[PDB]
Amino acid sequence: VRRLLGCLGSETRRLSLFLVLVVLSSLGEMAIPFFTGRLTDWILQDGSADTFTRNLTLMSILTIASAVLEFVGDGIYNNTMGHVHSHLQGEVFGAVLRQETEFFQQNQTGNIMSRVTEDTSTLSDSLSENLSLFLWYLVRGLCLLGIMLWVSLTMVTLITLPLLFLLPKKVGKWYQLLEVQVRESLAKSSQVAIEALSAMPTVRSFANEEGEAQKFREKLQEIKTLNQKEAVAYAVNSWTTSISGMLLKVGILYIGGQLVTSGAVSSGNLVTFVLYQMQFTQAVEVLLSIYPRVQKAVGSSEKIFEYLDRGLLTPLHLEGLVQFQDVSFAYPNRPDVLVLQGLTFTLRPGEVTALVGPNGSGKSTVAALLQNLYQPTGGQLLLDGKPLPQYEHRYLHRQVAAVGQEPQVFGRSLQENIAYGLTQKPTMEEITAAAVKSGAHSFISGLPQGYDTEVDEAGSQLSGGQRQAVALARALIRKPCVLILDDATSALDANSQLQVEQLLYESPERYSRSVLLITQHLSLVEQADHILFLEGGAIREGGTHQQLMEKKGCYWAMVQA
Amino acid sequence: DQVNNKVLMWRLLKLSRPDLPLLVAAFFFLVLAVLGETLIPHYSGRVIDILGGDFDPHAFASAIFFMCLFSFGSSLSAGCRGGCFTYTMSRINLRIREQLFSSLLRQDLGFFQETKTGELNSRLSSDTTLMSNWLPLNANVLLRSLVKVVGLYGFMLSISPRLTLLSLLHMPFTIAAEKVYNTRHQEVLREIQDAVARAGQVVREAVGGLQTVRSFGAEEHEVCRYKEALEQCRQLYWRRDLERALYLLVRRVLHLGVQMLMLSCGLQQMQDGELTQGSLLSFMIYQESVGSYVQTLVYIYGDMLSNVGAAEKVFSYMDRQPNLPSPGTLAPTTLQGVVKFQDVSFAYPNRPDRPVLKGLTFTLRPGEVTALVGPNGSGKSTVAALLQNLYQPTGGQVLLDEKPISQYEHCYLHSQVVSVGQEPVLFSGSVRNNIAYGLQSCEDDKVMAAAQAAHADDFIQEMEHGIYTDVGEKGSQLAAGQKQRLAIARALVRDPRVLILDEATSALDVQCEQALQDWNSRGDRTVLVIAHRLQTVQRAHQILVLQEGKLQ
Amino acid sequence: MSWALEMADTFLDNMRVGPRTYADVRDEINKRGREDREAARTAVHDPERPLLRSP
C-alpha cells in the first residue's frame, strides 16, 4: 500500500493545487438548491425584483465559474495523471529489460507481453477514472454534510441512508444466488461444447454430429427452463429497489408535512433539505461502487510491484587476448549442472578461433560468456587482462560483436537496422562500405529506395541470406575486435558462404579482428588458425586440423564422419 | 465498410423475428411506464395549485391518491418491461449458440487445425452474449427516449405553446455540437488505437529480439524510442479529455442559458399571460429532462454501428460452407467389402506445397488380412483417414466397390467403414453412451455382448451402476486398457463391414481382436493392419510396404 | 447475469445533467465485455494449442 501511494504521487503541490481548486468549485456546484429555495419562497411571499435578480446573477456567476474551475481542475488533473501514466509506463518497461535473461529464456512471451502493456494500462486507466470520482464526491459529501448543519436535519438523514441500502442488497443476495447457477450451467454448456469439438475427427469418423446437437439442445433447454425464474426475479428485484424510492419520498412528505404544519422550518428550507438529501443519496450511491474495484485493482498492483522489485573500463588501446582461466559457464536454473565446465581458453589478436563439438556442448554458452550476457559461474573469463563486468556497456558493445543463430531483423528501415545500436549516427559511406564489405550491398541496392526500404515483421521481405548478410553488416559496421557466430550460416547459399568465408579468412581487417564462431561450414573451420574440440563443456583437444587428423581425435572423427 | 455494417445489421435483426410478440408487449409496458412517469409531475403541480388556495380535502386527497397510484403503476410497469427485455436476451443468446455449434460441426477438419481453442470459446461465450445484449439494449434506450421526448413535448404543448418553441429551437444548437463532438471523438479513439498499436509493436519486436537487444546492448535507445512513441500517444488522450471537459463546460453553461432564458419568460407568463402557478413548476420539471434525453437520442443513432463489428467476427464462422463433396448417399444393399485406392495423391489441406503421399496405387483388398508397413511419420494414419474419408484426396480416386467415397452416404460410410485408433476417444457420457456412441437405437444385449466379446465385461461388471457408470471427462475413471477395450467394444457394437486398426492392437490385448476378426465376423470385410506388431504382419496375407509416400 | 441492461436502466432512471452521460455507459459495456473476452479464453486449457493437435 505505502509503496503504491508513495510511487504514484506527482509533485507535493500540483495535486494539492488541484485539491484546493476542487473544494472552492464544489461549493459553487452545490449552490443551486439554496437559490431554488429562495426562488420558491419568493413566489409564496415576496414580490421584489432586485433581490430576485441579485440571486439569479450570483446563481449564474457561481454556476458558470464552477464550470471553469472544473474545466481547469480536470485539465490539471488529467495533465498530472498523464505525467504519472507516462512515468509509470516508462519505469515498468525498463524493469523488464533490467532483469536477467533466465526469466526471458524460461518463461514465454505471452506473460511478458500481457503483464507489461495491458496490466499497467488497465490499472492506471482504472485508477485515473476511480480516484478522480472518489476525491470529487467525497469533497461534495463533506461540503454538503457541512452546509447541512447550517442538527436535527442531519440526525434525520444519517438514520435514513442505511434503510435505503438495506433492502436492495438483502433481497439482491437471494437474487445473486440464482445467477451463479446460470453462470455454472452456461460454463457447463461451453465446457461440453469445447469438449465435443476438440476431438473433431472422432466425431467426423462416425455420424454422431447430428446426435450431439440434440444433447446441446437439451442442455440449452435445461438453462431455458431455469431462465424463466431468473427473468421474473429481475423484475421482482426491480420492484423492491424502485418501491423503496417511493417509500423514502412519501416518508419525507409525511415527516416534512408535520414540520410544515408546525411551522418551524420554511418551505424553501424544506426544498433545500429535499434537494440536498436527494443529491447526497445519489452521490453516495456511486461512491460505494469504487471500494470493491480498489480491492480488485490493488491485487494486480502488488503483483506488478512484485514483478518490478526483482566500474566502466573505457576503450583506447585494443589488447585483444581473452583468457578463460579455469572457467565454468552455468545457467541460472541449475548451479551445479553447468553447460561449460573446466574452460581453459586463451585467445589472441589476429587468429580465427573454432569450437567443434556436438549439439548443446557449450557452444552457445561459450559465445554468450565471451559477449558477457550471462556471467561465469566459476573461474575467470578475462579480456585484455580484465574481467568483462569491469568494461563499460557501450565500450564492450563497441569491442565485442556477436551474430545470433536466429537472424532477427527490426521493423525500421535498412539504414536504421544496419546502423542499430550506436550513440553516434553512422555515415552513409560507412553504411555503404559495411554493406559492401559484409556482402549485403546487392540486397540493399537491389531493393526499392536503397537503405530507406522498411523491413517487414518477422523477416517477411528480406530472405535468410539477406537477413544473415544484414546481420553481418550490422556487426561489421561497428568494426569490433571480437567476432562471434553460433549457427549463423546454417541455410547459406554458395554465393553467401563464399562472401562470409572471404570476409572471415581473406579480408585484411581480420588481422585486427578475432573470429571465434561455431562453424556450420566445415571448410571455414578447416581453413582457420585456432581450434577446440568441445565435449559436454570440457575441451578434449585444442590444435590444428592437420595435427588433429595426424594424431586422430575428435577433429579427425568429425572430419571423417 | 459502411454498406457491410448496414447489411450485417439488416441480417442481425432478421434473426430476432421469431421473438416479435414479446417485444410488442415490452413496447406496450415501456410506453405505459413512460406515459405513467410523465403523468407524475402533472398531478404534483395540481396538488400545489389546489393546496395554496384552499385545503380542498377531496381534491387534495384524490390528487395525491391518483399520483401515488400512477407512481406505483409506473414502478410496476418499469419492472415487467425489464423482465421482458432480460428474457429476450436469453432467446437470441441460446439461439445463436445452437446455430453456431451446428454450423461448426458441418465444417471441414482442415479449419480446426487453424482455429484456436481459446478463441473459439471466447467467441462462443462473450461475443455471442454481446450480440444478444445488442438489440434489447439498443431498442430499450432508443424506444424509452423516443416515447419520452415526444411525451414530454406533448405534455408541454398541453400546458402552453408560448414557452415551447423557444426551448425547441435551442435543440439544433445542441444537436449540432454532438455531431462535431462524436466525429472528433471517434477519430481520436481510432488514432489512439493506432498510437497504442505502434507503441505495442515496439514491445513485440523487443520481446521478439530480446537476444538481439541484449547482445548489441543499447536498451536506453529502445526505452527512449518507446518513450518517444508514448509521448505522441499521450497527447491524444490529452486532446480527448480537453475536448470533453470543454463540452461539459459548454453544456453546463448552455443548459442554464436555456433554463434562465425560459424561466424569466415563465415569470412573465404568470403576470401578463396568466398561464398557471403550478404549471410553471411542472413545465420546469418537464424541461429539466427534455434536453438530457436528446443527448442520448443524438448519440445512439451514430453509436449503433460500433457494436456491429463484434458480430462480424461471429458471423465469419456462419459465412462460408465450401468444403467436402456433394451430399449424395449411395446405400449398401449388400456388404461389398472392397477397399480401393486408384493412383491416390495425399496432400494436407493446411499447406499445398508439402509432399505427404504420392502415387498410392494398389487396391484389390478383400480376402485374408491386409497390412500397412511403414516408418515413423510415413503417413499410415493419413491412409486410414483417406480410406475412412476424413480428408479429401489431392489426386487419384478412392474407389469403394466401383463407386466414389464422396458418393457414399455419410451414415452408410460411418456404418460400413471403421477405424480403431491408438488413442481412445473419451467423453463425459456414461458407459452405455460411450459403448453406443453414435447409435440411434443400440440393443442392451448387443452392448453387453459387444463388451463381453471386447473383454471389458469384468471391468463393466465391477463398475458402479454397471453399464450406466459415468465416464470421467478426458478419460478420468477408465484406465488405458479399459479405454482401448472400449474401442474394441465400439467396433463390436458397430459390427461394420470394413474395420481398420491404427496402432490399436499394440496397447490392447492380443487375443481379443482375433476372435472378432475370424470366421463370420471376419467376413464383414478386410482390415488395414497398421501397427508395429511383426507377428501380425507375418500372419497377414497382403503387405503394403510403404516408403517415403510410395509403395515399395 | 445481464449486467449491462441494469446499468442502462440506472442511467435512464436518473438522467440529470452530470459529467458521465451515455457515452461512458457504452464504454463500461466495452470494458466489461473485453474482461469477459479475456476471462473466457483463459479459463480452459491454453489458447496456443489448436483444436486438432496432430500435424
Author numbering:
A (entry chain A): 173 to 322, 325 to 484, 492 to 742
B (entry chain B): 130 to 681
C (entry chain X): 1 to 55
Please quote the paper that reports this structure.
With this map, we built and refined a model containing the 12 core TM-helices of TAP and the N-terminal 55 residues of ICP47. The N-terminal 34 residues of ICP47 are largely buried inside the translocation pathway, forming a helical bundle with TAP2 TM helices 3 and 6. In TAP, however, this gating region is cracked open by ICP47 to a width approximately 4 Å in diameter. In the TAP/ICP47 complex these residues are buried by ICP47, consistent with data showing that ICP47 precludes peptide binding.
TAP is an ER-resident transporter formed by two homologous subunits, TAP1 and TAP2.
